[PDB]
Design an enzyme around this catalytic site. Structure first.
Site, PDB file in Angstrom:
ATOM      1  N   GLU B  60     -24.142  29.474 -15.699  1.00 18.56           N
ATOM      2  CA  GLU B  60     -23.519  29.489 -14.288  1.00 18.56           C
ATOM      3  C   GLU B  60     -23.786  28.331 -13.754  1.00 18.56           C
ATOM      4  O   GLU B  60     -22.947  28.059 -12.818  1.00 18.56           O
ATOM      5  CB  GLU B  60     -24.163  30.767 -13.749  1.00 18.56           C
ATOM      6  CG  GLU B  60     -23.399  30.836 -12.294  1.00 18.56           C
ATOM      7  CD  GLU B  60     -23.963  31.947 -11.536  1.00 18.56           C
ATOM      8  OE1 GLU B  60     -25.210  32.648 -12.300  1.00 18.56           O
ATOM      9  OE2 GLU B  60     -23.708  32.360 -10.241  1.00 18.56           O
ATOM     10  N   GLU B 137     -35.465  25.817  -6.724  1.00 19.23           N
ATOM     11  CA  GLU B 137     -34.550  26.799  -5.844  1.00 19.23           C
ATOM     12  C   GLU B 137     -35.268  28.161  -5.795  1.00 19.23           C
ATOM     13  O   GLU B 137     -34.888  28.942  -4.998  1.00 19.23           O
ATOM     14  CB  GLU B 137     -33.062  26.862  -6.399  1.00 19.23           C
ATOM     15  CG  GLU B 137     -32.081  27.567  -5.768  1.00 19.23           C
ATOM     16  CD  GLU B 137     -32.078  28.992  -5.835  1.00 19.23           C
ATOM     17  OE1 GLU B 137     -32.716  29.448  -6.812  1.00 19.23           O
ATOM     18  OE2 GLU B 137     -31.461  29.760  -4.935  1.00 19.23           O
TER      19      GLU B 137
END
Ligand SMILES: CCCCCCCCCCCCCCCCCC(=O)OC[C@H](COP(=O)([O-])OCC(O)COP(=O)([O-])OC[C@@H](COC(=O)CCCCCCCCCCCCCCCCC)OC(=O)CCCCCCCCCCCCCCCCC)OC(=O)CCCCCCCCCCCCCCCCC
Ligand SMILES: CCCCCCCCCCCCCCCCC[C@@H](O)O[C@H](CO[C@H](O)CCCCCCCCCCCCCCC)COP(=O)(O)OCC[N+](C)(C)C
Ligand SMILES: CCCCCCCC/C=C\CCCCCCCC(=O)OC[C@H](COP(=O)(O)OCCN)OC(=O)CCCCCCC/C=C\CCCCCCCC
Lengths: 418, 446, 106, 54, 54, 51, 57, 32
Positions: B60, B137
């Protein structure tokens, strides 16, 4: 599968109505009124009014309004840009007939019960504190107060001290006045147009001509720097820009879209931004560099908008403006010009396409230009824009006086000029 | 003139063609000058075992970052040129690659998808970008609240179930996986008929099909080495989950009882219940002393910051549930009312409330179905679901289908005496212990 | 039909108002009504001045009932000096009640 | 206060052994009680709700 | 550091008679209840010694 | 007092009747079990505590 | 083209009696947060994140 | 953070009828 029956009335009120096979029956009654109309003497009658949309009418108890919404399954919402408040209501096709009356009854003459007003003065605090939750927002109502004398410098929301001191009477003022039947313009959709004139006339008779509508408000160079503790200062630099609907404003559009309106590659990259490539090569990653441009009917404000580290925001804003100068050098590859024109077309197509963006668009031209139009003509005038006229707009932003704002750590974020 | 029947029949239906390798094609002819191409791959987070828990999120995050056909900066500059808004995401179960775009670029767009899904180049430096970005992240995702709460909810309501683990997967698993195994993930999952081509708009169906034929015909269908995934009707544990964290300004909570699968007849009346509970938020002038009953009391005594009823449904099983933000002193209080609402739905569910919820539901459908992208997605998921685009005439016949008797029955079959799966991230302290929470699922009066 | 008989009716409205003790208390008829939840909210509907007035007048009346001396009759509220500023608020309250409840049952 | 009279009357009857004249005073006392509390007073307060125009 | 207020042992009494607000206007009639209380205490102490020999 | 009246209230009582009526039956039979009531015990084939 | 949505920048708040009180405008997003350090504001009587108006089943 | 948290085994405490990861809970709600 149609184009709308555009309208004028002797009392004046556009009632555009794009009849469709679309299930989502909707209307978006509009008002030309906004924060700009107020002066320093009465900030924030606007925001308390937009929350006063929930208040009881002469025609109905607030109980009956909120119940009248939820029961049918339909709902309401209030757009309110500085140039225009925008009431909106949405529902099923056989169910629009009652709900439409509500907003009419909403826009009629609701009483401004003093207890209800002080009660929503509670709402003002929360709604303001959460609206400005965004670091970006911290700049914007700020920035308009940075580059302007008055009207457009007005906050959309009343400052918290003003809140209790905001009064029902000021609401009586702004409603009795600026909510002109002429300035207002209904925008039907799923409903057939001709019946829309019918029920609208129940209210369209209300209210006399115009309102104060003075104080154009004009540019000032004034710096504003709030200073907060954020690690990521979001510096922004703006010269006044021509606006709006002028071909030069279109040049500003082509210019910012050279930078791009925003990323087109989620969780990816955006190389077609010119300034971002100009800065990232010279600065470590944690920042953003992007287009910005106010476009009010009275005035505009072009400028860089630059998310940045407090550790080195200055390198970012300078490299960015350096790239803007690079367009202002006359130094311009024509490839990304036409690519930017393509971005103009694309972004306009999407912003038109969704029913919300469609109706808000239709009103946005109809409230001022007064001219319903198919998008393609807009595509023609927007592709008509001169390639060098971009160099022109760049020359202007380099030329004009530069208000700057950058609430944040303000370690190394030098003032415009000095 | 305007009438509900026009709302019924003005909508064109999709065709469902299929390729040799089993990829299927569908696209409603919306007569829309803009078009959103789409491929909603059926691969998702529940599928992978713990060894490759985050692989779908990885792909992704690196589809366009490097493709075998052209350098990723070239494809990037291309999309930047076309002006099309490329996009992609991944649910637990529906990985999605779709390009919002102009109709004029359509053949370019679709072949561009062929450039994406069918093949990707993986620079080890690019993979290093993948890793360092995501590892930086994770900590940002911890900073978020709602996701972390639902992450606990899935991590606890299912536990040993494959579905239970995080979509992004483990912090350590991500700082470990080989490029080769990623290719293995692509090569075991990204193949038809897992892919389902779609693009509602002004796109002409036959051109879409023919256009698909030049690219996705190459795409594989046979599973490798006869290796074949198989599934489970996963158990639903009722274990409560109580993370605390006092330093956080507000308690933040989500309850969830077991629900029907993403293919279950009773889901529509259950959806009505979501309206019947009537979600709330702090901003509204619509609360005050009105709205839905729990929303009412939350607006009346300043209970809830906000709460949101929800009805997630995975293909095997769903999760009926609610989610409130909350001040510490009223934690129990929202709960004190909330469970009653469920019982309120059990015994004495007025039909007036039922039609209220149905109307809000219908509005929810039509509101969802505005725009090109949402309906391209509807085509892109309904096929993975029931198959079919499942036409609105059917949905609304099915909404008219519901009655208060049936409502009380289903609510009885899920709300009335059933073990809660509860998750919290607060601080929580006022919140009742499980039995006490469990105590509320059944009225002593009934 | 009815004519001057009604004049006699407000005649005995006046005389019985004199017969009422609160007339002698210097208290408005609004002052004496019981604080049911309806009435309380109706009080909170009130503008500040009428609030402080009803407050201080009821306070002086209570002080006179404490020291158990009656007001001078000169200082009596006259039958025609009085206002009735709770009434609209009250009628609003009951109407809201009937509205919310008829909405409830339906 | 008439109710006060009715109850004191019940006391004075209560000192009096069962007898015919006190039988009539008996049922009269009972009915007097009933009408004095259960019905009359609220109707009166209604009547002054008219007089005070509540 | 009030010995009354702060100290729980007696706080209920501060909630009670020591410092409960009461209306400025009160006749003997409201004093009658407290009279009834004292009479009750007396009924206890008297009935008690009665039982002490009865 | 008139509030008890209402369209939902009719349906509502209609709904609550099984649960509360059940209680009455349970309460009645249980109360018979508690007082060990006579004449119904005549009617039970099994529980005759009487010889 | 005079709609603010067509010219990214100034806010166009849409507060409502039903749907969550959406407001704000780009000020471009998405690719900002992904690069290192970006906490994003959290919990100070915060209104609900993400928001859901497009429900199905 | 939210990622590395995990639910440690309880199967030894679990009922035998629900002891395995494949079966429906709802099938066992009645017997349990
Ligand atoms: C005066 C007007 C009467 C109004 C009554 C309205 C009806 C509601 C009611 O009565 O509630 C009790 C209860 C309602 O419970 P509910 O329907 O689940 O809703 C209560 C809410 O949860 C309310 O929330 P909750 O937190 O209070 O619920 C917890 C639980 C309270 O339970 C407790 O925690 C108390 C435990 C104390 C025991 C200490 C033992 C020490 C050794 O609820 C109860 O009050 C029921 C306790 C059962 C014993 C009855 C206590 C009455 C005093 O109704 C009944 O218990 C009646 C049915 C069963 C009784 C048998 C009758 C056979 C004949
Ligand atoms: C069961 C049925 C009963 C029916 C009848 C009930 C009658 C109740 C009677 C009791 C009620 C209280 C009586 C009222 C007394 C008036 C107050 C008086 O005592 O003065 C108080 C004074 O009380 C004492 O100071 C209290 C502390 C001293 C106590 C020492 C006890 C000394 C004698 C005890 C003898 C015990 C001998 C035991 C040997 C083993 C202070 O209160 P105050 O009215 O404001 O006076 C203001 C004047 N100042 C300035 C002087 C204070
Ligand atoms: C006509 C209508 C009449 C209805 C009246 C019903 C009252 C009958 C019994 C009431 C006694 C209450 C004590 C019950 C104790 C108890 O609560 O046990 C737990 C159970 C369920 O609790 P939850 O699961 O938390 O409910 C949540 C529902 N959402 O409640 C029960 O009723 C079961 C009772 C079993 C517990 C027994 C202990 C009760 C306390 C006993 C102490 C009494 C001491 C008093 C002595 C005084 C002597 C002079």
């Amino acid at each position: 599968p149609q184009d709308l029956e555009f309208t004028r009335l002797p009392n004046g009120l556009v009632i555009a109505s794009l009849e469709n096979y679309a299930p989502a029956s909707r209307i978006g009654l509009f008002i030309k009124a906004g924060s700009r109309y107020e002066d320093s003497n009465n900030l924030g009658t606007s925001h308390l009014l937009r929350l006063a949309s929930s208040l009881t009418t002469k025609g109905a108890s607030s109980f009956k309004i909120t119940r009248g919404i939820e029961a049918v399954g339909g709902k309401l919402s209030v757009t309110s840009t500085r140039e225009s408040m925008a009431y909106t209501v949405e529902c099923l096709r056989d169910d629009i007939e009652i709900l439409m009356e509500f907003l009419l009854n909403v826009t009629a003459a609701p009483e401004f019960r003093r207890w209800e007003v002080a009660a929503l003065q509670s709402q003002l605090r929360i709604d303001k504190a959460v609206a400005f939750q965004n670091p970006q927002a911290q700049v914007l109502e700020n920035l308009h107060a940075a580059a302007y004398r008055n009207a457009l410098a007005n906050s959309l929301y009343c400052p918290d001290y003003r809140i209790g001191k905001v009064t029902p009477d000021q609401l009586h003022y702004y409603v009795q006045n600026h909510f002109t039947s002429a300035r207002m313009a209904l925008i039907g959709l799923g409903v057939s147009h001709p019946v829309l004139k019918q029920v609208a006339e129940r209210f369209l008779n209300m209210r006399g001509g115009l309102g104060l509508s003075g104080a154009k408000a004009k540019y000032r160079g004034g710096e504003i720097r709030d200073q907060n503790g954020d690690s990521l200062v979001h510096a922004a630099l703006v010269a006044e820009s021509a606006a709006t609907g002028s071909a030069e404003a279109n040049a500003f559009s082509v210019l910012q879209h050279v930078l791009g309106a925003g990323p087109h590659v989620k969780r990816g990259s955006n190389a077609t931004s010119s300034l971002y490539q100009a800065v990232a090569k010279g600065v470590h990653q944690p920042f953003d560099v992007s287009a910005f441009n106010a476009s009010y009917s009275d005035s505009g404000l072009f400028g860089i908008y630059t998310i940045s580290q407090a550790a080195s925001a200055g390198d970012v804003i300078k490299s960015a403006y350096d790239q803007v100068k690079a367009i202002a050098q006359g130094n311009l590859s024509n490839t990304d010009v036409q690519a930017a024109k393509n971005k103009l077309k694309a972004g306009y197509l999407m912003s038109v396409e969704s029913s919300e963006g469609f109706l808000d668009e239709v009103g946005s031209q109809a409230l001022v230009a007064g001219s319903y139009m198919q998008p393609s003509t807009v595509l023609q005038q927007i592709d008509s824009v001169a390639d060098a006229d971009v160099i022109n707009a760049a020359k202007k932003f380099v030329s004009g006086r530069k208000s700057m704002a950058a609430s944040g750590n303000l370690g190394h974020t030098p003032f415009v000029d000095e | 003139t305007a009438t509900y029947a026009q709302a019924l029949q003005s909508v064109p239906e999709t065709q469902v063609s299929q390729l040799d390798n089993g990829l299927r094609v569908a696209s409603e002819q919306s007569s829309q000058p803009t078009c959103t191409v789409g491929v909603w791959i059926d691969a998702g987070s529940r599928y992978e075992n713990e060894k490759n828990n985050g692989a779908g999120y990885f792909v992704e995050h690196l589809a366009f970052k490097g493709t075998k056909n052209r350098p990723g900066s070239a494809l990037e500059k291309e999309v930047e040129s076309m002006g099309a808004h490329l996009n992609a995401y991944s649910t637990r179960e529906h990985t999605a690659y779709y390009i919002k775009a102009l109709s004029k670029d359509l053949p370019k767009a679709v072949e561009l998808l062929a450039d994406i899904v069918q093949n990707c180049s993986l620079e080890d430096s690019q993979i290093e970008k993948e890793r360092d970005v995501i590892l930086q992240e994770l900590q940002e995702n911890d900073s978020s609240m709602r996701d972390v709460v639902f992450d606990y909810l899935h991590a606890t309501a299912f536990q040993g179930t494959p579905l239970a683990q995080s979509v992004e997967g483990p912090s350590e698993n991500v700082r470990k996986l080989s490029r080769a195994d990623l290719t293995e993930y692509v090569s075991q999952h990204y193949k038809a008929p897992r892919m389902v081509l779609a693009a509602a708009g002004g796109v002409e169906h036959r051109q879409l099909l023919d256009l698909a034929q030049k690219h996705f015909s190459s795409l594989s269908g046979t599973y490798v080495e006869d290796a074949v995934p198989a599934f489970t009707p996963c158990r639903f544990t009722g274990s409560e989950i109580r993370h605390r964290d006092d330093a956080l300004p507000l308690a933040h909570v989500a309850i969830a009882v077991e629900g029907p699968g993403w293919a279950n007849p009773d889901n529509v009346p259950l959806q009505v219940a979501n309206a019947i509970i009537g979600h709330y938020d702090s901003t509204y002038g619509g609360g005050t002393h009105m709205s839905s009953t729990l929303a009412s009391v939350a607006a009346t005594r300043k209970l809830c910051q906000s709460f949101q009823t929800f009805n997630i449904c995975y293909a095997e099983t769903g999760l009926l549930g609610a989610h409130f933000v909350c001040d510490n002193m009223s934690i129990d209080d929202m709960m004190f009312f909330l469970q009653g609402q469920w019982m309120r739905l059990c015994t004495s569910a007025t039909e007036s409330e039922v039609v209220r919820g149905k109307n809000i539901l219908r509005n929810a459908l039509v509101s969802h179905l505005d725009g090109t992208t949402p309906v391209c997605e509807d085509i892109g998921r309904s096929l993975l679901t029931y198959g079919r685009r499942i036409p609105l005439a059917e949905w609304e016949s099915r909404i008219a289908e519901v009655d208060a008797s049936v409502v009380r029955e289903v609510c009885s079959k899920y709300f009335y005496d059933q073990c809660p799966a509860v998750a919290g991230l607060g601080p929580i302290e006022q919140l009742p212990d499980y039995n006490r929470i469990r105590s509320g699922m059944f009225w002593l009066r009934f | 039909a009815v004519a001057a008989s009604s004049k006699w009716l407000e005649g005995i409205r006046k005389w019985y108002y004199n017969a009422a003790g609160f007339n002698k208390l210097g208290l408005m008829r609004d002052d004496t009504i019981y604080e049911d939840d309806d009435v309380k909210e109706a009080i909170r509907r009130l503008p500040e001045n009428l609030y402080n007035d009803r407050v201080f007048r009821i306070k002086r009346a209570l002080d006179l009932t404490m020291r158990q001396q009656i007001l001078p009759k000169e200082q009596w509220t006259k039958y025609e000096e009085d206002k009735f500023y709770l009434e609209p608020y009250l009628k609003e309250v009951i109407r809201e009640r009937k509205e919310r409840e008829e909405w409830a049952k339906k | 206060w008439m109710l006060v009279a009715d109850l004191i009357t019940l006391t004075w009857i209560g000192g009096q052994p069962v007898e015919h004249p006190f039988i009539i005073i008996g049922q009269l006392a009972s009915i007097l009680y009933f009408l004095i509390i259960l019905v009359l007073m609220p109707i009166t307060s209604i009547i002054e709700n008219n007089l005070l125009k509540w | 550091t009030n010995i009354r207020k702060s100290h729980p042992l007696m706080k209920i009494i501060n909630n009670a008679f020591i410092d409960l607000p009461a209306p400025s206007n009160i006749s003997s009639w409201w004093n009658f209840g407290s009279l009834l209380g004292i009479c009750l205490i007396l009924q206890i102490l008297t009935g008690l010694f009665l039982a002490m020999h009865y | 007092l008139s509030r008890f009246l209402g369209p939902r209230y009719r349906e509502l009582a209609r709904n609550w009747i099984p649960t509360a009526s059940m209680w009455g039956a349970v309460g009645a039979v249980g109360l018979v079990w508690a007082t060990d009531w006579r004449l119904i015990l005549d009617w039970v084939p099994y529980i005759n505590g009487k010889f | 083209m005079l709609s603010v949505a067509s010219r990214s920048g100034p806010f166009a708040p849409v507060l409502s009696a039903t749907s969550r009180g959406v407001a704000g405008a780009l000020r471009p997003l998405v690719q900002a947060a992904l690069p290192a350090t970006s906490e994003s504001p959290v919990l100070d009587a915060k209104r609900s994140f993400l928001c859901r108006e497009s429900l199905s089943g | 953070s939210h990622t590395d948290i995990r639910v440690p085994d309880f199967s030894d405490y679990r009922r035998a009828e629900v002891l395995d990861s494949t079966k429906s809970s709802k099938e066992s709600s009645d017997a349990r």
